[PDB]
Motif scaffolding. Structure first.
Motif, PDB file in Angstrom:
ATOM      1  N   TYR A   1       0.874  -1.116  -0.197  1.00 11.21           N
ATOM      2  CA  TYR A   1      -0.114  -0.028  -0.076  1.00 11.21           C
ATOM      3  C   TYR A   1       1.017   0.990  -0.136  1.00 11.21           C
ATOM      4  O   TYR A   1       0.387   2.286  -0.491  1.00 11.21           O
ATOM      5  CB  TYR A   1      -0.934   0.133   1.365  1.00 11.21           C
ATOM      6  CG  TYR A   1      -2.293  -0.852   1.089  1.00 11.21           C
ATOM      7  CD1 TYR A   1      -1.958  -2.147   0.969  1.00 11.21           C
ATOM      8  CD2 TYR A   1      -3.556  -0.098   0.906  1.00 11.21           C
ATOM      9  CE1 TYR A   1      -3.306  -3.069   0.774  1.00 11.21           C
ATOM     10  CE2 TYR A   1      -4.694  -0.849   0.777  1.00 11.21           C
ATOM     11  CZ  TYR A   1      -4.601  -2.329   0.817  1.00 11.21           C
ATOM     12  OH  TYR A   1      -5.602  -3.338   0.722  1.00 11.21           O
TER      13      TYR A   1
ATOM     14  N   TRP B   1      -5.316  -6.570  -3.372  1.00 14.33           N
ATOM     15  CA  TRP B   1      -5.818  -5.634  -3.724  1.00 14.33           C
ATOM     16  C   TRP B   1      -7.198  -5.378  -3.851  1.00 14.33           C
ATOM     17  O   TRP B   1      -7.854  -4.428  -3.512  1.00 14.33           O
ATOM     18  CB  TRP B   1      -5.075  -4.942  -5.140  1.00 14.33           C
ATOM     19  CG  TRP B   1      -5.259  -3.552  -5.177  1.00 14.33           C
ATOM     20  CD1 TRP B   1      -5.928  -2.818  -6.354  1.00 14.33           C
ATOM     21  CD2 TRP B   1      -4.900  -2.528  -4.506  1.00 14.33           C
ATOM     22  NE1 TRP B   1      -5.985  -1.478  -6.184  1.00 14.33           N
ATOM     23  CE2 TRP B   1      -5.236  -1.217  -4.947  1.00 14.33           C
ATOM     24  CE3 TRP B   1      -4.088  -2.529  -3.375  1.00 14.33           C
ATOM     25  CZ2 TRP B   1      -5.062  -0.027  -4.742  1.00 14.33           C
ATOM     26  CZ3 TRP B   1      -3.801  -1.174  -2.740  1.00 14.33           C
ATOM     27  CH2 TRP B   1      -4.206   0.082  -3.414  1.00 14.33           C
ATOM     28  N   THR B   2      -7.675  -6.446  -4.495  1.00 14.93           N
ATOM     29  CA  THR B   2      -9.286  -6.557  -4.742  1.00 14.93           C
ATOM     30  C   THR B   2      -9.931  -7.560  -4.147  1.00 14.93           C
ATOM     31  O   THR B   2     -11.139  -7.608  -4.257  1.00 14.93           O
ATOM     32  CB  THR B   2      -9.370  -6.744  -6.118  1.00 14.93           C
ATOM     33  OG1 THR B   2      -8.989  -8.152  -6.707  1.00 14.93           O
ATOM     34  CG2 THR B   2      -8.594  -5.668  -6.946  1.00 14.93           C
TER      35      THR B   2
ATOM     36  N   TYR C   1     -12.369  -0.310   3.999  1.00 15.10           N
ATOM     37  CA  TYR C   1     -12.286   0.716   3.291  1.00 15.10           C
ATOM     38  C   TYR C   1     -13.696   1.207   3.002  1.00 15.10           C
ATOM     39  O   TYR C   1     -14.628   0.656   2.709  1.00 15.10           O
ATOM     40  CB  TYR C   1     -11.335   0.534   1.945  1.00 15.10           C
ATOM     41  CG  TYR C   1     -10.123  -0.040   2.432  1.00 15.10           C
ATOM     42  CD1 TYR C   1      -8.769   0.854   2.703  1.00 15.10           C
ATOM     43  CD2 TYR C   1      -9.848  -1.433   2.607  1.00 15.10           C
ATOM     44  CE1 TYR C   1      -7.836   0.351   2.855  1.00 15.10           C
ATOM     45  CE2 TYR C   1      -8.716  -1.971   2.982  1.00 15.10           C
ATOM     46  CZ  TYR C   1      -7.503  -0.827   3.245  1.00 15.10           C
ATOM     47  OH  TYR C   1      -6.319  -1.627   3.456  1.00 15.10           O
TER      48      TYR C   1
ATOM     49  N   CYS D   1     -15.825   0.180  -0.067  1.00 16.97           N
ATOM     50  CA  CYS D   1     -16.611  -1.209   0.062  1.00 16.97           C
ATOM     51  C   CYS D   1     -16.934  -1.821   1.390  1.00 16.97           C
ATOM     52  O   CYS D   1     -16.150  -1.532   2.258  1.00 16.97           O
ATOM     53  CB  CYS D   1     -15.647  -2.154  -0.453  1.00 16.97           C
ATOM     54  SG  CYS D   1     -14.713  -1.391  -1.960  1.00 16.97           S
TER      55      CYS D   1
ATOM     56  N   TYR E   1     -10.542  -6.263   4.357  1.00 23.28           N
ATOM     57  CA  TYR E   1      -9.640  -6.609   3.449  1.00 23.28           C
ATOM     58  C   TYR E   1      -8.364  -6.785   4.420  1.00 23.28           C
ATOM     59  O   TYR E   1      -7.984  -6.004   5.154  1.00 23.28           O
ATOM     60  CB  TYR E   1      -9.103  -5.664   2.405  1.00 23.28           C
ATOM     61  CG  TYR E   1     -10.220  -5.572   1.478  1.00 23.28           C
ATOM     62  CD1 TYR E   1     -10.072  -6.252   0.057  1.00 23.28           C
ATOM     63  CD2 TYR E   1     -11.422  -4.784   1.846  1.00 23.28           C
ATOM     64  CE1 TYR E   1     -11.316  -6.127  -0.830  1.00 23.28           C
ATOM     65  CE2 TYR E   1     -12.585  -4.929   0.560  1.00 23.28           C
ATOM     66  CZ  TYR E   1     -12.301  -5.494  -0.354  1.00 23.28           C
ATOM     67  OH  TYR E   1     -13.514  -5.549  -1.504  1.00 23.28           O
TER      68      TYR E   1
ATOM     69  N   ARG F   1     -13.340  -4.988 -10.354  1.00 22.46           N
ATOM     70  CA  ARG F   1     -14.248  -5.798  -9.683  1.00 22.46           C
ATOM     71  C   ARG F   1     -15.552  -5.853 -10.411  1.00 22.46           C
ATOM     72  O   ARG F   1     -15.796  -4.605 -10.745  1.00 22.46           O
ATOM     73  CB  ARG F   1     -14.543  -5.488  -8.416  1.00 22.46           C
ATOM     74  CG  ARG F   1     -15.321  -6.199  -7.479  1.00 22.46           C
ATOM     75  CD  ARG F   1     -14.315  -7.473  -6.843  1.00 22.46           C
ATOM     76  NE  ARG F   1     -15.088  -8.192  -5.982  1.00 22.46           N
ATOM     77  CZ  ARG F   1     -14.801  -9.295  -5.422  1.00 22.46           C
ATOM     78  NH1 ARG F   1     -13.712 -10.035  -5.862  1.00 22.46           N
ATOM     79  NH2 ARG F   1     -15.635  -9.909  -4.590  1.00 22.46           N
TER      80      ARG F   1
ATOM     81  N   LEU G   1     -16.206  -1.828 -11.021  1.00 22.19           N
ATOM     82  CA  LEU G   1     -15.146  -0.952 -10.262  1.00 22.19           C
ATOM     83  C   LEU G   1     -13.836  -1.122 -10.798  1.00 22.19           C
ATOM     84  O   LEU G   1     -13.167  -2.510 -10.287  1.00 22.19           O
ATOM     85  CB  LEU G   1     -15.343  -1.142  -8.854  1.00 22.19           C
ATOM     86  CG  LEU G   1     -14.356  -0.515  -7.883  1.00 22.19           C
ATOM     87  CD1 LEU G   1     -14.300   1.164  -8.049  1.00 22.19           C
ATOM     88  CD2 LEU G   1     -14.398  -0.935  -6.356  1.00 22.19           C
TER      89      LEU G   1
ATOM     90  N   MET H   1      -9.990   0.460  -9.647  1.00 22.81           N
ATOM     91  CA  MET H   1      -9.400   1.542  -8.725  1.00 22.81           C
ATOM     92  C   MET H   1      -7.862   1.210  -8.618  1.00 22.81           C
ATOM     93  O   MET H   1      -7.417   0.592  -7.752  1.00 22.81           O
ATOM     94  CB  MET H   1      -9.912   1.488  -7.262  1.00 22.81           C
ATOM     95  CG  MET H   1      -9.748   2.637  -6.452  1.00 22.81           C
ATOM     96  SD  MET H   1     -10.922   2.977  -5.008  1.00 22.81           S
ATOM     97  CE  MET H   1     -10.913   1.401  -4.144  1.00 22.81           C
TER      98      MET H   1
HETATM   99  C1  LIG Z   1     -14.652  -4.973  -4.265  1.00 22.12           C
HETATM  100  C2  LIG Z   1     -13.468  -3.978  -4.083  1.00 22.12           C
HETATM  101  O1  LIG Z   1     -12.849  -3.865  -5.303  1.00 22.12           O
HETATM  102  C3  LIG Z   1     -11.760  -2.905  -5.540  1.00 22.12           C
HETATM  103  C4  LIG Z   1     -11.039  -2.550  -4.105  1.00 22.12           C
HETATM  104  C5  LIG Z   1      -9.805  -1.704  -4.119  1.00 22.12           C
HETATM  105  N1  LIG Z   1      -9.248  -1.355  -2.985  1.00 22.12           N
HETATM  106  C6  LIG Z   1     -10.176  -1.205  -1.714  1.00 22.12           C
HETATM  107  C7  LIG Z   1     -10.245  -2.411  -0.880  1.00 22.12           C
HETATM  108  C8  LIG Z   1      -8.667  -2.736  -0.370  1.00 22.12           C
HETATM  109  N2  LIG Z   1      -7.628  -2.674  -1.105  1.00 22.12           N
HETATM  110  C9  LIG Z   1      -7.163  -1.330  -1.624  1.00 22.12           C
HETATM  111  C10 LIG Z   1      -7.884  -1.186  -3.017  1.00 22.12           C
HETATM  112  C11 LIG Z   1      -9.196  -1.626  -5.450  1.00 22.12           C
HETATM  113  N3  LIG Z   1      -9.769  -2.093  -6.652  1.00 22.12           N
HETATM  114  C12 LIG Z   1     -10.864  -2.973  -6.618  1.00 22.12           C
HETATM  115 BR1  LIG Z   1     -11.637  -3.454  -8.050  1.00 22.12          BR
END
Ligand SMILES: CCOc1cc(N2CCCNCC2)cnc1Br
Ligand SMILES: CCOc1cc(N2CCCNCC2)cnc1Br
Ligand SMILES: CCOc1cc(N2CCCNCC2)cnc1Br
Ligand SMILES: CCOc1cc(N2CCCNCC2)cnc1Br
Ligand SMILES: CCOc1cc(N2CCCNCC2)cnc1Br
Ligand SMILES: *[C@@H]1O[C@H](CO)[C@@H](O)[C@H](O)[C@H]1NC(C)=O
Lengths: 205, 201, 202, 203, 204
Positions: free
Chosen positions: C89, C143-144, C182, C185, C189, D104, D112, D114
């Motif tokens: 991060y 990350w996801t 976060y 969402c 995580y 996602r 999404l 990010m």
């Molecule tokens: C369902 C969440 O999808 C995400 C979350 C994140 N982040 C928020 C969750 C914790 N990881 C950092 C990025 C980045 N890209 C996608 Br695509």
């Protein structure tokens, strides 16, 4: 045949991995450097950055076509052609190819590839700031093909050395000379050919 | 067979992802560094930039062909061959491969790959500006294959070294090692190349 | 089965894009950083360059094979395998992967991937030139993928592989597992925070 | 359906090159920058290096699946999806994407993406070393799709929550403004979001 | 036809390697540089970093489709199209393409490709710090296609030279002029066209 047909046939049949040797004679490669610019000279470290067109010609009869009623030449991505594995021995960075990577192919199989390249070299920079200037020697040859597979020769023609050289460079070209060599390295029994291009240049006032 | 046939056969049947182990005896890899230049030395940070030919040989019998009435050797893109997963342990940049990525393959399956590489290393630079010079040790071995799969062995010091470098080579020595890391139960082989060099006066 | 067969089967059937979740349980990923070097420290900007092996393990049963009279392990290009989408991060450069990108796969489906990585981080460099040193915290997680898809855990001698030629030395390494929500969402995580306590040598 | 099936279907039928426009209406893209760090500020040259999460959302119904008795969401490599062709107009380096390039996807087609991005920008750095700070404006919009094909809108939120406490700088305020611009090259209007980052050096 | 069909047809039949020459006439390429920023000027070395949109247009009829009851335009990855092999002769770094690599294709086959590019050039930086400023000349043309295959022309348009130029640059644009040339290089017998864009600029 139109250009589309020619390019299609070349793409479908060309063997980029196969050296176009004919009757077990070497592929005769011509190499000529057209200097465009000299940047970032360092007399302490004996390093220099140069921009040059690397004019490379050879023959590959597998590309040939009957050009009666057809285009006589086409531009072809080098990824679709065999290309000589040339390298500059005293380069200290990999070639930065500045231009679109296309070769020109003539209907008889003659190929011209002339990219503009920026590359850093280790060479003799001493005297770059004197009247007589520095003489930087650039050595280019096939990396892996010995003299029975690839021969390398300077281009037979005369020319204005500075013809394409930038008037805005801090440096100027006094002379360019070429010498062909054939060297045996202790690693391998065969001889490998190279061209040495000696660039005599100095800093302008 | 002509070159086209040989290269076609190799391309169609080479398993670049398959280590050419025979009877579960290790692939014997030879490694030798031919130093071309030393640039950008830093005695404060103990870092150095080197250009060297990484001469690498090994045998892959799956590449073999009958060479009576045929070429004895061909140049092959390494993307079409299995290549040892060698890495320099104390490198601090990834290898900048300066040359066309082709290996030379002999009809019996012997392979030579010798790219010119520029790479930065972390090593002992102290004494570089003295008569006895510095000694920089470069450690190279298979990243993921233990000694039963890959063995590594060492093969004029300045023969190919640039006369225009600010540095000069005093001596090059080699030592083979076999190391067990606490992460893994098996031993991993490496070659340590000790480059003794100094700044020219 | 020989190695060629095993590798062929893996290549032909591997789904690198499919998380090897089994029975709705998260994929249990272990992460451990083996520090090799510390370069380019900057106490003014709070940035540091680190070289480390990123030891990563997990299980993918889809890779498994019957290993009686067969090799027990193979090296596999990660391009042919699903790999956890881990990121640091507080990294401020993308990972420079220094080593060949191969994972080790065991016949039961256990995977080990351990590249050497050079990366720059934003972290607390203050005190690096003092007795107690600086403590740089590195945060790594999926990350996801949230906690029902990927869990992350620290692995159950800090300078063992650390370069003796670095200008710095490692005083201590500690690890902490976290589970974070976060605002983007609803799910949690997981991450591992590796605290690297280091200082400049004489 | 399990995840393998869903990802297989998406991979096999995804048209990454086809904008998921539905019924003459533009694809509604939401954009929000979550600032992580500010590095390498230069008040002489008016350039700045920023690290930010580029939160991007839109809908693509071609990705949808029946999720009864199935996973509701999956992670998908962006190489298998259409993605908005967003660019920062005043960026002077290409985006350095720091994170795995996965989006996602929800079973109704909501996407999404990010990534964390490091990028250098040309903008107003003056006053960075004062109490009121500098205000750097970042302009982001579709490069090639006009307002009838892509709309861009900001996502009232703390875009500062994730900002590094170890940066030499601190964020005072972030504001957003939506624009619709005609360029003399083209007859149509192109939408953008301007994100104004008010920040200063810590004392 | 919907967009999906159009893009599918283009992808399936496009020959990115084939110059869309029609009936022994050169492909007419228009080039225009929209300057966005000037960074990293060096009067000692005569080098400069510029950011510009490289507006490039041409016609490729093989891309055409019947647009009655269909979209009139689509965005297409340039990897699926033939694109002119333009290069800046006095560039000393390769183009850093800043933006998504998509061209806009109209149903009649007209193409527009306009990436934002950052590139370093060797040119005349002298006087950049004076009232009359420096004049940096940028030379752009087809690398490998002579005048019977590709023609290059400046865009017919009149323009505001600074319209997109950054107000935050340390430099300002005084004037931009364009000149078309047809040159014979000693390497080859044919003529090669280029456009020379003269950027007159100074430090603020
Ligand atoms: C369902 C969440 O999808 C995400 C979350 C994140 N982040 C928020 C969750 C914790 N990881 C950092 C990025 C980045 N890209 C996608 Br695509
Ligand atoms: C057996 C020769 O094959 C070679 C030779 C060389 N070199 C020695 C010959 C001249 N070129 C420099 C490298 C490098 N790679 C392979 Br593969
Ligand atoms: C089972 C060993 O697999 C490994 C080992 C290593 N290392 C430890 C062994 C010696 N090489 C250094 C890395 C890295 N990646 C994988 Br995958
Ligand atoms: C339909 C026009 O196509 C365009 C427009 C632009 N620009 C002007 C429109 C707004 N985006 C900035 C670039 C760039 N490339 C292509 Br292709
Ligand atoms: C037919 C000439 O083929 C060429 C020419 C050039 N140039 C000479 C013509 C003008 N462009 C600069 C390079 C480069 N590559 C190939 Br291939
Ligand atoms: C285009 O297709 C439409 C049918 O919808 C028709 O009006 C017209 O004849 C076609 N044009 C051409 C030139 O084929």
């Amino acid at each position: 045949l139109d250009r589309a047909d020619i390019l299609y046939n070349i793409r479908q049949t060309s063997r980029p991995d196969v050296i176009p040797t004919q009757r077990d004679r070497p592929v005769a490669v011509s190499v000529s450097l057209k200097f465009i610019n000299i940047l970032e000279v360092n007399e302490i470290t004996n390093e220099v950055d140069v921009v040059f067109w690397q004019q490379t010609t050879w023959s590959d009869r597998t590309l040939a076509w009957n050009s009666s009623h057809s285009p006589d030449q086409v531009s072809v991505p080098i990824s679709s052609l065999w290309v000589p594995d040339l390298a500059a021995y005293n380069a200290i960075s990999k070639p930065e190819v500045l231009t679109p990577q296309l070769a020109r192919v003539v209907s008889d199989g003659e190929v011209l590839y002339m990219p503009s390249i920026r590359q850093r070299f280790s060479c003799d920079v001493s005297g770059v700031d004197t009247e007589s200037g520095a003489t930087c020697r650039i050595k280019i040859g096939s990396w892996t093909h010995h003299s029975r597979e690839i021969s390398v020769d300077p281009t037979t023609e005369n020319s204005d050395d500075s013809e394409y050289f930038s008037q805005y460079s801090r440096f100027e070209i006094l002379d360019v000379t070429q010498k062909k060599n054939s060297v045996t390295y202790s690693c391998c029994p065969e001889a490998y050919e190279d061209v040495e291009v000696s660039l005599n240049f100095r800093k302008k006032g």
